[PDB]
């Protein structure tokens, strides 16, 4: 039936039968000064999926940087580490069709629209606000080359399945759950100058619906940090 | 040990010699240099970039020839953080912590091994971050990937020398596979690309 | 449990509509759906309920309260609501994000037709709010909006201390 | 699945999983001259639920007073007693929405529209024909003050949940079953001058539907007397 | 010798042989939402004891109201409870003489300089800043009648020994330690509108010293909350 999950002072519901993807077959564990006061769900503002939407992305350490206590622990520490559980859900009827790829990409270093330059901080991440992929080649001096077909990385978008992911096909499921382990070259790092991974949501089959149906589908992203560690 | 195994294994895929650098230096005027890098050659770069992190040792072989006594050449390796020459006679050429190889023509080519030397536990092929947060020019620069620098000079007291540097990764471990690059490379210092089509085109969607 | 007249606005009090909280499918996302003070002194939405009538016969009381919210839209309607609780002295939230960072539950009407909260109530008094995290998605146009009904009852170990006249005569 | 119930020479069906409310936790029992010839289902004429319907009510001993043998046993006896099972069902699609309160109210003595007067027999009950609640204050010399908000009793309608009841929320259920025990101040009574209880059906959420859907929902009430007793 | 005491991230030293007074023979215990993140020492700004000093006082819940986390827990809660350990020390040489009474007074409601009025909030407490007793009758509309001989309460100052206290006679000791239990008429209270106790430091023998000696003696007050409790 329906499973109610409570973390801290926040509660969400998921389908009891929903599938969970554990990236690289690894669950987050501790190696430090632990903090479990932030182990709550943070629900990001929902985005609306339209017939023409090209896709959305979030950089994670940055996406939660303004979120109360999580944001404060980043601000009061020199080094830190965390794993995350990401819950992605769609609100759609049986008269809606479409298909999304929900993928977590480690070290998603992005290219600039201008070859001679590097992208700026806001074009790469707008914090808790989703960044948007383009259907066209983008342009600007500090702009990210967000054209969808290359996922902002210069690779074919159809090959992103190499990274932890789940497909959402509205005729069979409206949700995805990804457990993302800490992945880096070092045990702990500065959480403000490095994004451990990027969450990308990319439609592969356009949203479509019957003629009297709602013209958009809300997509909600809920984030739950695990095993957070900081320097003493 | 490693070679009598499938060619699909990571070590057989990556542990192949490549010419990564070609240069010249003269006995009058005066020295060559190369910062050790993995983004220098497109075929090598592409294979390594199919991974996010890698840990390996480096084997370096030098093919040196010359054109107008026995001619002696000095190859110096400066570890990350060591002093470097600016002049043919800079003091750094004599530093005890900057290993050198003295070699003469007619002998087998010079060869040295450099171990994994990063402070971190792996070299990063990609870096979604900044060396300095507020400096846009530092996006993508991971200071833990400094493999050191090579310098070459003729040892003496109108000769032209040419150097071919052969690089081979050894005992290679890799983590977190990535899609192969679709776009052509633009610069060694970036991941910038020209948007590119996913594949070649067809005239119709059907079988014939 | 009795039905709480949450939508008791001046023009709704004389109608059954006082008990019907409106939900609109084209609302601005993040806007407030409804909310109310849990003020014990003359609780405007809770003092004529079965609970409220009894507590109004005593000078002092204390215990916990159960609040149930029931969605009455069509079977194929789906979307999420944020139900947030603000402890006494905290103040009501002004935005969906502020509410999200406090104490709350995400209620998905496509999974559950109702959601139950349990809060303390004694005698500012704390607040209940509900935000439109998403709008309500439907397969077809309807001729009207969706409603939410609210119910209240004493949750557990509720006590009263000194009998007095009712103020309603 | 579906449960088929036969009483006497009448059969009805209910959902096997439907919930049953037993008023006051009490099942009807015998204390007299029993009569089981009337222990059959009596289905009352269905009422149509529209977007603007204010609600309906029935007085029970009176609602069945013309129903063949039940009506005759009332007519041929001085005193009597009975308990009832009431089955209420709605016929609606998944494209319909709305919510009803189905409640049985003991001794539902009603007020008159004119304060100086008392309501008459027909304004209080139209026998097997449902009486209708008003959205407006009613008027007349013998009229019942049927305005819905006071349930005809001078109480708030939202507090009727104190009496045996079940909610029908069309997104989850289309039915209610109430077992109503005999409740009185005396063991047996005259069944023509006293209504032991009133069945009220009051919408709390208006009927609404998709644009191509049927504009009304039938509501059917089926009554099954139990443990009927009469004087010898 | 010397005893080093660490609480949280703060350390103080006391003489190993120093005496501890436990008010009313009671140690603080828990009855609620506990918080031990504030169980650290808070050292208040030192006051200087001169030949003519009349004395000093602090209201406790208020004295710590700006102290980081303690102040925040008062601000984020409706009700709370706490006990305190108070360490009072003097820095003086063997060429100094004088004597202080260090006393904790529960419910030290103070009188106003103007009989017709009540004292204001700042005249009663200046938070972490010590309030000062006067040698003269004070005057003002909201001023506290701080004349020392009546301790601000209308009692003789020599009878304050009824409350938990310790004497500091500089020829024998330069310190006092008082453990103050929670004392009230109710289990928990609003910590902003009620001062559970007042700490008073009153000289009974004036500071005096040899002619080449330092002309003042610093008095330092260090506070350590215990068993703090707040509403959930």
Is C162 within 8 Å of chain D by CB?
A: no
Reference C137, options A49, E212, B152; nearest CA is A49
Please state whether at least 3 CB pairs lie below 8 Å between chains E and C: yes
Resolution reading in Å: 2.6
Q: Which residues from chain C sit within 8 angstroms of residue D152, using beta carbons?
A: none
Question: Chain B residues with CB-CB distance to A under 8 A?
Answer: 52-53, 118, 120-124, 126-133, 136-137, 139-140, 142, 144, 176-183, 186-187, 190-199
The Cα of D149 is separated from the nearest Cα of chain C by a number of Å equal to: 6
The sheet with strand B72-78 has its strands ordered as B32-35, B149-155, B72-78, B100-104
Q: Which residues from chain A sit within 8 angstroms of residue C102, using beta carbons?
A: 9
Is A220 within 8 Å of chain C by CB?
A: yes
Query: How far apart (Å, rounded) are the C-alpha atoms in residues A53 and E119?
Result: 67
User: Which chain A residue's Cα is nearest to B139?
Assistant: A118
Place of tokens 């404060």: A72
DSSP string, B157-203: ---EEEEEEEEEEEEEEEES--PPB-SPP--TT--------SS---S
Query: How far apart (Å, rounded) are the C-alpha atoms in residues A86 and C125?
Result: 35
Percent helix / strand / coil, chain E, rounded to 5: 10, 40, 45
Q: Closest CB to C3: pick one of D135, D204, D206.
A: D204
DSSP string, E119-179: --HHHH-BTTBPEE-BSS----SS-B--BGGGTTTTS-GGGGGGSSEEEEETTT-SEEEEE
Pairing assessment for the beta strands C103-108 and A10-15 based on DSSP bridges: parallel
Q: Do A150 and B177 touch (CB under 8 A)?
A: no
Query: How far apart (Å, rounded) are the C-alpha atoms in residues B26 and B19?
Result: 21
Reference A210, options A99, A95, A132, A131; nearest CA is A95
Q: Do C1 and D149 touch (CB under 8 A)?
A: no
Is A104 within 8 Å of chain C by CB?
A: no
Please state whether at least 3 CB pairs lie below 8 Å between chains B and E: no
- Those residues whose C-beta lies under 8 Å from the C-beta of residue E28, and which sit 6 or more positions away, are E82, E83, E84, E179, E181, E182, E226, E227
Quick check: B35 and B141 in contact, CB under 8 A?
A: no
CA atoms within 13 A on the CB side of D137: 7
Continuous H helices in chain D: 60-63, 69-75, 121-124
Exposed, middle or buried: residue A205 (CB in 10 Å: 0-12, 13-18, 19+)? middle
Q: Which residues from chain C sit within 8 angstroms of residue E232, using beta carbons?
A: 87
Q: Which residues from chain C sit within 8 angstroms of residue E231, using beta carbons?
A: 87-88
Q: Do C3 and D205 touch (CB under 8 A)?
A: no
Bridge partners (DSSP) listed for residue E13: E4
Structure tokens at B15: 């542990």
Phi and psi, residue A62, nearest 5°:
-75, -40
Query: How far apart (Å, rounded) are the C-alpha atoms in residues C34 and B141?
Result: 50
The Cα of A44 is separated from the nearest Cα of chain C by a number of Å equal to: 8
Rg (CA), chain B: 20
Per-residue b/e over B4-27, b at no fewer than 16 CB within 10 Å? eeeeeebbebbbeeeebbeeebbb
Is C139 within 8 Å of chain A by CB?
A: yes
Query: How far apart (Å, rounded) are the C-alpha atoms in residues B4 and D158?
Result: 83
- Those residues whose C-beta lies under 8 Å from the C-beta of residue C97, and which sit 6 or more positions away, are A45, C30
Place of tokens 């079965």: C50
Is A10 within 8 Å of chain C by CB?
A: yes
The Cα of E143 is separated from the nearest Cα of chain C by a number of Å equal to: 31
Query: How far apart (Å, rounded) are the C-alpha atoms in residues C105 and C122?
Result: 23
Is D52 within 8 Å of chain C by CB?
A: no
Reference A84, options A223, A229, A230; nearest CA is A223
Is C67 within 8 Å of chain A by CB?
A: no
Is C50 within 8 Å of chain D by CB?
A: yes
Chains touching E, CB cut-off 8 Å, 3+ pairs: C
C interface test, pick of E32, E73, E78 with most C CB neighbours within 10 Å: E78
Structure tokens at D206: 């208006």
Q: Do A10 and C140 touch (CB under 8 A)?
A: no
Reference B81, options B103, B96, B66, B97; nearest CA is B97
DSSP string, D181-214: ----SSSSB-SSS---EEEEEEEEEEEEEBTTS-
Is C20 within 8 Å of chain D by CB?
A: yes
C interface test, pick of A2, A4, A6, A11 with most C CB neighbours within 10 Å: A11
The total number of residues shown for chain C amounts to 169
Distance of alpha carbon B11 from its chain centroid, rounded? 17
Place of tokens 């959902």: D15
Query: How far apart (Å, rounded) are the C-alpha atoms in residues E180 and E86?
Result: 8
Reference B145, options B167, B129, B123, B130; nearest CA is B123
Structure tokens at E167: 């004497």
DSSP string, A134-157: BSS----SS-B--BGGGTTTTB-G
* Beta-carbon pairs below 8 A across chains C and D: 101
Specify whether the backbone of D39 is left (phi greater than 0), alpha (psi in -120 to 50) or beta: beta
Structure tokens at A31: 């190696």
Q: Which residues from chain B sit within 8 angstroms of residue A193, using beta carbons?
A: 129-133
Is C102 within 8 Å of chain E by CB?
A: no
The Cα of C132 is separated from the nearest Cα of chain D by a number of Å equal to: 20
Is A25 within 8 Å of chain B by CB?
A: no
- Those residues whose C-beta lies under 8 Å from the C-beta of residue C10, and which sit 6 or more positions away, are none
The Cα of C68 is separated from the nearest Cα of chain E by a number of Å equal to: 21
The Cα of A83 is separated from the nearest Cα of chain C by a number of Å equal to: 20
Q: Do A109 and B192 touch (CB under 8 A)?
A: no
Q: Closest CB to D99: pick one of C1, C48, C149.
A: C149
Query: How far apart (Å, rounded) are the C-alpha atoms in residues C3 and D161?
Result: 8
Bridge partners (DSSP) listed for residue C84: C104, C129
Quick check: E186 and E108 in contact, CB under 8 A?
A: no
A interface test, pick of B39, B45, B121, B128 with most A CB neighbours within 10 Å: B128
Exposed, middle or buried: residue A193 (CB in 10 Å: 0-12, 13-18, 19+)? middle
Quick check: A104 and A181 in contact, CB under 8 A?
A: no
Structure tokens at A87: 């819950």
The helix (run of H) or strand (run of E) holding residue A66 is: none
Q: How many CB atoms are located within 10 Å of the residue C146 CB?
A: 24
User: Which chain E residue's Cα is nearest to C119?
Assistant: E232
Q: Which residues from chain E sit within 8 angstroms of residue C88, using beta carbons?
A: 78, 231
Quick check: E164 and E108 in contact, CB under 8 A?
A: no
The helix (run of H) or strand (run of E) holding residue A63 is: helix A60-63
The Cα of D160 is separated from the nearest Cα of chain C by a number of Å equal to: 8
Q: Do D210 and C74 touch (CB under 8 A)?
A: yes
Is E78 within 8 Å of chain C by CB?
A: yes
């Amino acid at each position: 039936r329906v499973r109610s999950i409570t973390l801290g002072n926040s509660t969400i519901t998921t389908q009891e039968c929903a599938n969970v993807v554990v990236g690289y077959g690894t669950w987050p564990t501790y190696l430090t000064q632990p903090d479990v006061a932030t182990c709550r769900f943070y629900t990001l503002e929902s985005v609306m999926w339209q017939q023409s939407s090209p896709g959305w992305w979030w950089k994670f350490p940055d996406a939660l940087s303004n979120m109360g206590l999580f944001g404060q622990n980043m601000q009061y520490h020199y080094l830190g580490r965390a794993g995350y559980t990401l819950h992605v859900q769609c609100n759609a009827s049986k008269f809606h069709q479409g298909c999304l790829l929900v993928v977590c990409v480690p070290e998603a270093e992005m290219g600039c629209a201008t070859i001679a330059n590097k992208p700026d901080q806001k074009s790469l991440s707008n914090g808790e606000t989703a960044n948007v992929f383009d259907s066209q080649n983008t342009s600007g001096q500090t702009a990210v080359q967000a054209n969808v077909i290359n996922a902002g990385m210069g690779i074919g978008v159809g090959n992103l399945t190499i990274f932890p992911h789940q497909w959402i096909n509205l005729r069979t499921n409206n949700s995805a759950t990804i457990v993302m382990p800490y992945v880096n070259s070092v045990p702990m790092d500065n959480m403000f100058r490095h994004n451990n991974f990027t969450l990308m949501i990319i439609p592969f089959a356009p949203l479509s619906y019957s003629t009297g149906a709602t013209t958009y589908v809300p997509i909600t992203v809920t984030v739950a940090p695990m095993c957070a560690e900081y320097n003493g | 040990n490693y070679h009598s195994r499938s060619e699909s294994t990571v070590e057989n895929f990556l542990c192949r010699s490549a010419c990564v650098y070609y240069t010249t230096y003269k006995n009058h005027g005066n020295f060559a240099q190369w910062v050790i890098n993995t983004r220098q050659v497109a075929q090598l770069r592409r294979k390594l970039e199919m991974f996010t992190y890698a840990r390996f040792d480096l084997e370096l072989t030098f093919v040196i020839t010359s054109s107008q006594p026995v001619l002696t050449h000095q190859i110096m390796y400066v570890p990350p953080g060591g002093p470097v020459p600016t002049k043919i006679n800079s003091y750094s050429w004599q530093t005890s912590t900057n290993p050198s190889v003295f070699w003469t023509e007619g002998s087998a080519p010079p060869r040295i091994s450099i171990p994994f030397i990063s402070i971190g536990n792996a070299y990063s092929m990609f870096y979604d971050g900044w060396a300095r947060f507020d400096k846009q020019g530092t996006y993508g620069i991971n200071t833990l990937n400094n493999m050191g620098t090579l310098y070459m000079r003729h040892v003496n007291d109108p000769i032209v020398s040419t150097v071919r540097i052969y690089f081979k990764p050894k005992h290679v471990k890799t983590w977190v596979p990535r899609p192969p690059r679709l776009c052509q490379y633009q610069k060694a210092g970036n991941v910038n690309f020209e948007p590119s089509g996913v594949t070649e085109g067809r005239t119709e969607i059907t079988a014939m | 449990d009795s039905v709480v007249p949450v939508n008791n606005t001046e023009g709704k009090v004389m109608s059954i509509e006082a008990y019907q909280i409106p939900v609109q499918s084209n609302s601005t996302n993040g806007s407030q759906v409804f909310g109310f003070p849990l003020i014990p002194g003359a609780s405007s939405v809770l003092n004529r309920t079965l609970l409220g009538e009894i507590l109004n016969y005593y000078t002092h009381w204390s215990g916990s309260i159960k609040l149930t919210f029931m969605f009455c839209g069509s079977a194929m309607a789906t979307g999420k609501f944020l139900l947030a609780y603000s402890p006494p002295g905290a103040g009501a939230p002004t935005t969906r994000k502020e509410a999200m960072l406090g104490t709350h539950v995400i209620w998905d009407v496509g999974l559950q037709s109702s959601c139950v909260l349990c809060i303390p109530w004694i005698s500012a008094g704390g607040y209940i709010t509900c935000w439109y995290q998403t709008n309500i998605v439907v397969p077809a146009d309807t001729q009207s909006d969706c409603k939410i009904l609210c119910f209240v009852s004493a949750c557990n170990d509720f006590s009263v201390r000194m009998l007095k006249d009712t103020p309603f005569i």
